[PDB]
Design a protein around this motif. Structure first.
Motif, PDB file in Angstrom:
ATOM      1  N   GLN B   3      17.168 -44.896  49.377  1.00  0.00           N
ATOM      2  CA  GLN B   3      15.780 -45.312  49.608  1.00  0.00           C
ATOM      3  C   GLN B   3      15.598 -45.731  51.069  1.00  0.00           C
ATOM      4  O   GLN B   3      14.665 -45.279  51.736  1.00  0.00           O
ATOM      5  N   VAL B   4      16.509 -46.553  51.583  1.00  0.00           N
ATOM      6  CA  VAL B   4      16.439 -46.935  52.994  1.00  0.00           C
ATOM      7  C   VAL B   4      16.409 -45.721  53.936  1.00  0.00           C
ATOM      8  O   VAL B   4      15.572 -45.657  54.830  1.00  0.00           O
ATOM      9  N   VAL B  28       6.880 -44.954  49.180  1.00  0.00           N
ATOM     10  CA  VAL B  28       8.244 -44.377  49.073  1.00  0.00           C
ATOM     11  C   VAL B  28       8.956 -45.041  47.914  1.00  0.00           C
ATOM     12  O   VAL B  28       9.371 -46.181  48.073  1.00  0.00           O
ATOM     13  N   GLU B  29       9.127 -44.365  46.770  1.00  0.00           N
ATOM     14  CA  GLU B  29       9.767 -45.008  45.586  1.00  0.00           C
ATOM     15  C   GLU B  29      11.064 -44.385  45.084  1.00  0.00           C
ATOM     16  O   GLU B  29      11.352 -43.199  45.324  1.00  0.00           O
ATOM     17  N   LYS B  30      11.826 -45.198  44.349  1.00  0.00           N
ATOM     18  CA  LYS B  30      13.101 -44.775  43.771  1.00  0.00           C
ATOM     19  C   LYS B  30      12.986 -45.058  42.281  1.00  0.00           C
ATOM     20  O   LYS B  30      13.337 -46.151  41.791  1.00  0.00           O
ATOM     21  N   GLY B  70      12.912 -53.977  38.624  1.00  0.00           N
ATOM     22  CA  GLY B  70      13.320 -52.935  37.668  1.00  0.00           C
ATOM     23  C   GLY B  70      12.243 -51.902  37.349  1.00  0.00           C
ATOM     24  O   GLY B  70      12.544 -50.842  36.769  1.00  0.00           O
ATOM     25  N   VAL B  71      10.996 -52.225  37.713  1.00  0.00           N
ATOM     26  CA  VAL B  71       9.855 -51.333  37.554  1.00  0.00           C
ATOM     27  C   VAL B  71       9.634 -50.522  38.851  1.00  0.00           C
ATOM     28  O   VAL B  71       8.740 -50.817  39.647  1.00  0.00           O
TER      29      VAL B  71
END
Lengths: 1022, 150, 100, 50, 50
Positions: B3-4, B28-30, B70-71
């Protein structure tokens, strides 16, 4: 293992050697700091919107940056300040264990992408995402002693020569600064500038052209042609580097060639960036530099190291500028580490002097002295093996455990002269026989003590970490002992062994005493009825004793709390600081080292209003009286100050762990939860507050931790009016801002450093509302209009500080326990009070009362499982769902006495006393292990009798107990219980142990033999 | 970490995306592509619309779950409100007015401005009295947007 | 920007913040006459390059706002750097049908 | 996680408007609970059959 | 005013060398101790070591 080791001998040592080497080798790899990392990890985002105000900063910056903190892992809760100096601060506290080095990434990265939605002027100043951790290794302070430098100039030197110098110095983990950096000030004047028909915009958008810097190109460089001789780089326009170059800025030229320079409308000169925090050190212009730890560095190493770099650069300062230290968390660590390491040196001599006064040698008594320093040096390696540091907490974590370390040494070497004397063999052959009576029961106190310790180190968080700090040190030492007493002390005292008057002077008191047992054991359950009255005392001794975290302590400094009323001014506050400065110097010249007075900071908020006085003291040496210490000086000053007008001036001593959960108090958050307004939320809060003071039997000091609404001046641009005139909202709004708010134009390079350029009306033409008209804007046609043409102006009530809990406007109110009641009760009433508040208002718990909630009642549940592991562990040492029940009833005999330091001092139930309360239940059960072991040893082996063994057990035991108990009640006696300074916990560490270790012995000797008989005669039946 | 890294590189482009795109919020999501669960929100009372709930839910419940550790992603099955200036082109014309005009209007009549304060941070001689100067406030109702002067 | 007015205006500012960062072994930068900065932070052997990268970006950020506008709206990349190429796949075109 | 979403919403409910219910259209959590609580139910009852 | 330092290869090289007469030392001390250990004599090492 020990018998097939007694022989090896030579070996051991090695071991030893190693342990002792590795241990010493670690004493070097070890970090040192007052305390170790125990606050949940947390990141603050900070932002500024020059000359703003709450509502603006809040609706323009804060709600943005929040509707964005998402997709970030491990968020406990988030808090937010939007005050009225144009500053936002947002702190996200993280889950206990979350790596903080990545918590910060995720935040500051989800921030990185909200940015474009922020006001162009904030995006300049720059939003900051750092790690919130105000544990400050020290704060220097550069002062000038001959009125030749100012606040701002001193700032400049610090920022220009020493800041970096320190920043790159062997440890310094963070270098923050106590001032500006010499921003370029340009202080307009409406009049000097209306006489030309110029606004500040003309000034602004004309500094931007004059003080810029553009690209040019190289000569040859990018694709050339033919053969070329020369390539070089073209140097175009480049930034102004002085107040003079700034004076000469053509702002305009009228028809006649008029010299309308920037010089003439404004006034240039070097000054501060910000201008509303005043640093003074004993009345003089100050501008220090605060410094944080490093993570894995040395508080002493770098403490020393900082002074070196300062020493190096001190021949450079011109007009005498001292480099003062009004805060160093080092002399406090040092003469607390020089102590403690004394307790070791000493409690050692205590086991030389006792032991000798019992066995009377210079070979057997030396073993213990050579044995313990080996167990210690060695635990220092297991500490370092788990990352741990040498810190105030881990430190005492051993001191609280020296008792258990010693008693193992004594117990072994003792039970050799109670074999090779009592019709016994030589040296080697005696130890071999004795390492058969203790052998099993040591590798059995081990498991027993692994319980009643390990089941600590498992508590919640913030505090739960402090506990672990003890557990791992103790259970490390403790188990490293048994290990060293099965391998070294056998093979040592079997290869070294064969005051005066004593002996028989004791040998007729072993007989006198053992007849208090037997011959008095005729009734049997005679004393068991007294024991129920020791339990039924203990169970009342608990509930009464008050609760605490960490004995508040004298540390070198303390603080005064100035707090002028509503609309008060920095100037007006200075005087109130001036008195404080004076009182503390003039009328206390023999405790007070210095007062570092900063106005513009504070408790509940920032502002022209308030300040704070940082006062550092003389060396505790030169502070001899007990009232020459802190708890007393505040006593004085605090009251000595309630003789001032409107200027609530408090003074208190910092809590031990500076950056941690203060009072046994609660931390309450009143949240919004519908389109309820500020105003609505206020009424709601104002109710709860009112409805809470009605119950002083339950809560005292319910209070807002926030500012109250103050008035404000509402300029109000009439649009139509401006449309009709030639004047644009854009030129209006700037000019108010510009003049009054100040604005940050471009940058420039003063002295080879990049430094800001600010532009803002002189102080003269911007103070009172009646000045608002002072200012003119040039409309479409080119004629200056006064604000009155297109404004109205109409006093109203705002809020200088707006609060938010987890993305909803909150209002933080924090209150205290209750003189009598428990934090848990205070919280729980405070919740019923919350529960009857106008619909669409909610409460949540934060800070301390957040852990307090999540974790909370656990201590009496984890130990529920130690006790179950102890019994289950113990039973196996013997062979019974019965015999162990005899070893456990020892527990209260340590509690009482220790719990009876409600009397023998005036103290509270805290971390320390509780860890002490474990070391005490530690020897107490370990004695009951050995005694109940013998009573089963010679009753199983030599076939002995139902009560023959009980006599012959306590017989062969009474002295080993007495030997160690006296080593301890004298080893725990010194400055520990009755101390001067750099102390506090000292008193707490011990007082628990001391008396209560008294009752642990002088009461367990008559009692545990009884305990062995009240089982067996009941277990097996008839 | 991944992600970074995705994000360091993104960040280099950021200055190149059209202002209109930044403005929205490049995310920007994981997360897993699968829905872990779906949270339904009804009105029994018939006291609200759908149009009303999408908005209630967004302003009131979406941020929480969104920030719940966690979401790694939240989809709103609908949308939050906005001030909607549903233009009419006849009128706009009737009075010699482009949409440009409307915006440049909506821009200056709907603003939040910082106007310094009274006891000016670096002050004079000696003065008591210090309070914030408060200027324009963002309109907060169909009602005031409506009154925009065109 | 020309070296002296490049470094010191950007190089300083970054360099100035690269303090704290665990296992820092030695920093070393250089401005340029093209206006190009290269600060390099090489950490102690061992050291988690990934967690090392992360702090070198957790500090860089505090420098960012203090950097010129054009410098910002352009670059500033923090990457796990090496020094030596491992390979150099060159490419030519047979039959002058293609150019440099 | 779905513990905590269901926990968040909980503290959210008190302050809704009039007829606003959280209903539960879709969700993978329960099956996974019911799932393992059956494999372990077997774990017991098959020691009952030894 | 002008100082110096090694970097890259140098700094690594230097470090290697300075370590050695702190490497040999411990290693010996360990062997010596390992003999005394499981060879029973505080004296046979003294002589192996020779």
């Amino acid at each position: 293992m020990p018998n097939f080791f007694i022989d090896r001998p030579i070996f051991a040592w090695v071991i030893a050697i190693i342990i002792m080497l590795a241990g010493g080798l670690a004493i070097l790899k070890l970090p040192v700091a007052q305390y170790p990392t125990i606050a949940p990890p947390a990141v603050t985002i900070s932002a500024s919107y020059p000359g703003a105000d709450a509502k603006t900063v809040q609706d323009t910056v804060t709600q943005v940056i929040e509707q964005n903190m998402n997709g970030i892992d491990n968020l406990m809760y988030m808090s937010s300040n939007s005050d009225s100096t144009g500053t936002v601060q947002i702190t996200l506290t993280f889950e206990s264990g979350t790596d903080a080095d990545i918590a910060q990434v995720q935040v500051q990265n989800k921030l990185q992408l909200a940015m474009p939605l922020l006001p162009q002027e904030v995006q300049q100043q720059g939003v900051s995402v750092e790690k919130s951790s105000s544990s400050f290794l020290m704060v220097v302070g550069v002062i000038n002693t001959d009125g030749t430098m100012t606040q701002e100039d001193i700032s400049d030197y610090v920022a220009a020569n020493m800041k970096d110098a320190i920043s790159r110095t062997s440890g310094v983990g963070d270098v923050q600064l106590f001032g500006s950096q010499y921003a370029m000030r340009i202080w307009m004047n409406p009049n000097e500038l209306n006489k030309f028909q110029l606004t500040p915009v003309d000034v602004i958008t004309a500094i931007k052209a004059q003080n810029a810097q553009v690209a040019a190109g190289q000569l040859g460089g990018t694709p050339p042609v033919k053969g070329q001789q020369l390539n070089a780089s073209i140097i175009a326009q480049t930034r102004l580097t002085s107040t003079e170059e700034f004076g000469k800025i053509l702002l305009k030229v009228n028809q006649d060639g008029s010299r309308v320079l920037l010089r003439d409308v404004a006034k240039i000169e070097l000054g501060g960036e910000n201008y509303d925090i005043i640093a003074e050190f004993n009345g003089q212009p100050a501008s220090g530099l605060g410094i944080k730890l490093a993570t894995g560095a040395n508080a002493l190493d770098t403490a020393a190291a900082i002074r070196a770099e300062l020493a190096k650069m001190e021949p450079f300062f011109p007009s005498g500028l001292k480099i003062v230290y009004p805060y160093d968390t080092t002399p406090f660590v040092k003469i607390s580490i020089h102590e403690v390491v004394k307790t070791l040196v000493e409690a050692i001599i205590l086991v030389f002097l006792v032991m000798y006064l019992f066995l009377q040698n210079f070979r057997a008594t030396l073993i213990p002295t050579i044995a313990v320093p080996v167990v210690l040096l060695g635990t220092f390696a297991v500490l370092a093996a788990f990352g741990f540091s040498i810190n105030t907490l881990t430190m005492f974590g051993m001191v609280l455990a020296i008792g258990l370390l010693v008693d193992d040494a004594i117990v072994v070497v003792e039970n050799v002269e109670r074999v090779m004397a009592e019709e016994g063999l030589p040296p080697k052959e005696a130890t071999r026989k004795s390492m058969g009576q203790i052998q099993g029961a040591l590798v059995g106190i081990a498991m027993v003590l692994s319980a009643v310790f390990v089941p600590m180190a498992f508590f919640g968080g913030s505090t739960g970490a402090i506990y672990r700090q003890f557990s791992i040190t103790i259970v490390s030492a403790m188990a490293l002992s048994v290990l060293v007493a099965l391998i070294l002390t056998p093979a040592l005292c079997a290869t070294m062994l064969k005051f005066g008057w004593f002996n028989r002077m004791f040998e007729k008191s072993t007989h006198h005493y053992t007849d208090s047992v037997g011959g008095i054991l005729r009734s049997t359950g005679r004393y068991l009825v007294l024991y129920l009255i020791i339990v039924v005392g203990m169970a009342y001794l608990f509930v009464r004793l008050p609760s605490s975290f960490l004995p508040d302590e004298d540390q070198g400094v303390f603080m005064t709390m100035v707090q002028l009323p509503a609309g008060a001014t920095q100037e007006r506050t200075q005087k109130v600081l001036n008195e404080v400065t004076h009182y503390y110097l003039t009328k206390e010249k023999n405790n007070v080292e210095s007062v570092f007075a900063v106005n513009g900071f504070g408790f509940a908020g920032r502002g022209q209003n308030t300040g704070i006085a940082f006062v550092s003291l003389k060396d505790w040496a030169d502070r001899p009286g007990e009232e020459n210490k802190v708890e007393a000086i505040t006593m004085r000053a605090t009251r000595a100050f309630s003789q001032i007008k409107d200027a609530m001036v408090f003074a208190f001593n910092l809590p031990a762990i500076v950056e941690l959960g203060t009072a046994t108090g609660f931390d309450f958050e009143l949240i919004d939860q519908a389109g309820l307004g500020h105003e609505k939320l206020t009424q709601a809060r104002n109710q709860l507050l009112a409805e809470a003071a009605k119950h002083p039997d339950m809560l005292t000091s319910v209070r807002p931790n926030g500012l109250e609404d103050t008035p404000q001046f509402k300029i109000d641009i009439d649009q139509e009016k401006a449309q009709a005139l030639g004047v644009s909202i854009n030129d209006i709004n700037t000019t108010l801002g510009a003049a009054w708010g100040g604005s940050y134009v471009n940058d420039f390079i003063d002295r080879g450093r990049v430094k800001k350029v600010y532009v803002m009306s002189e102080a003269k033409y911007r103070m009172l509302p009646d000045d608002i008209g002072d200012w003119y804007v040039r409309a479409a046609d080119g004629q200056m209009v006064p604000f009155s043409a297109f404004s109205s102006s109409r006093w109203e009530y705002g809020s200088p500080r707006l609060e938010r809990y987890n993305g909803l406007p909150s209002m933080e109110i924090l209150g205290q326990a209750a003189p009598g009641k428990s934090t848990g009760e205070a919280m729980e009433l405070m919740e019923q009070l919350a529960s009857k508040l106008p619909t669409g208002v909610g409460y949540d718990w934060t800070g301390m009362s957040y852990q307090e909630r999540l974790s909370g009642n656990q201590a009496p549940s984890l130990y529920a499982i130690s006790l179950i592991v102890v019994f289950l562990c113990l039973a196996a040492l013997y062979e019974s769902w019965s015999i162990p029940f005899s070893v456990m009833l020892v527990v209260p005999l340590g509690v009482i006495g220790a719990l009876l330091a409600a009397t023998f001092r005036g103290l509270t139930n805290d971390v320390y006393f509780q860890v002490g309360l474990l070391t005490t239940i530690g020897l107490s059960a370990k004695n009951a292990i050995l005694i109940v072991e013998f009573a089963k040893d010679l009753m199983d082996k030599e076939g002995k009798g139902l009560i023959e063994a009980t006599l012959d057990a306590v017989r062969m035991r009474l002295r080993p107990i007495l030997m160690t108990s006296l080593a301890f009640i004298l080893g725990v006696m010194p400055l520990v219980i009755s101390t001067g300074a750099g102390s506090g916990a000292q008193n707490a560490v011990g007082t628990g142990v001391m008396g209560g270790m008294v009752t642990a012995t002088v009461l367990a000797i008559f009692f545990v033999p009884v305990f062995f008989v009240v089982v067996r005669r009941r277990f097996s039946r008839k």
